[PDB]
Design a protein around this ligand. Sequence first.
Ligand SMILES: Nc1nc2c(ncn2[C@@H]2O[C@H](COP(=O)(O)OP(=O)(O)O)[C@@H](O)[C@H]2O)c(=O)[nH]1
Ligand SMILES: *C/C=C(\C)CC/C=C(\C)CCC=C(C)C
Lengths: 148, 185
Amino acid sequence: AKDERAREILRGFKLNWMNLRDAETGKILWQGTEDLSVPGVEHEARVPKKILKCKAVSRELNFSSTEQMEKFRLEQKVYFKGQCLEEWFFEFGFVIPNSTNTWQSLIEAAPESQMMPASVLTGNVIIETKFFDDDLLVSTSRVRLFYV
Amino acid sequence: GTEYKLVVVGAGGVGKSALTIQLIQNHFVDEYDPTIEDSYRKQVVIDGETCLLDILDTAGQEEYSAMRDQYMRTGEGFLCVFAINNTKSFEDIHHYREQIKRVKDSEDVPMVLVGNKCDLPSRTVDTKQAQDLARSYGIPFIETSAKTRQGVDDAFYTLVREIRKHKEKMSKDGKKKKKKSKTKC
Ligand SMILES: Nc1nc2c(ncn2[C@@H]2O[C@H](COP(=O)(O)OP(=O)(O)O)[C@@H](O)[C@H]2O)c(=O)[nH]1
Ligand SMILES: *C/C=C(\C)CC/C=C(\C)CCC=C(C)C
């Protein structure tokens, strides 16, 4: 029953676009329209290295869902050379059936001392993203991150 | 100058009023006191820190739904009182705990279990039964006699220490989230 509901949600779920903006200035640094949320294939993303100098970035995800969800949410694990560097939890909440929604998250930079150079990070960062509706796992996907 | 709202709950006749009067006025029921008992503000020093205890005896208010809701929402810590000669009052304890937990929508509400009237020889609730219940909840158990004053301060002071542990834990978590919630991307 839970297996069937997770299948139904993923079948009706679509990631339309995503972008990253500098939080202070609002200028779009990167935009993707690929469904980087597809579970089977490891996706690649090439983001400008100036992203690392931003005091904070705003990430916007636009998605559609045929199925209603009560507590739509995300868990992200950031791996650097296979070691978990960071863990993030984001909550959207209630998704109206057949709706299309924009979800904005603010991600503030660590102090300058703890920031890692683009030359060290590039190609060695994997972002594993799990999409959930409460405690129900809908999908897992991975993106390999390059800084160019 | 921090105010701790302490709420004394338990079945009728267990000694909630007697315990409160003994904390506040340093004496057992004696002379006539026409005072309507609800809440009382008392300055005390616990472990070298001066604080204000806002102590609510719920004997009157427990019968009224909106009053119960209010004292369970506003209370920071709860004395859950039974009498050691009344097995029914001990059986009622879990009802009070579950109500408080539901109203506050939290699993670690500061509480102390109190077995009152320990001056009486006709005991029907063993110290071990009571200790087991308290261990099952992860809270202190203290035996009191409002009549002799045994354990009265200990009961209320232990509850304040439980509130302080809770408050100190919440402030460390708030700091720990601030530090953790920054990215290297
Ligand atoms: N022997 C004895 N009697 C007590 C003690 N505490 C309260 N009582 C008596 O038990 C009765 C009920 O006490 P009260 O404080 O009115 O209970 P409440 O209804 O829980 O507030 C009264 O007759 C009190 O004198 C105690 O520690 N020892
Ligand atoms: C500060 C750097 C960030 C937030 C890295 C950008 C992340 C991606 C591109 C991958 C995000 C993947 C999903 C939202 C499914």
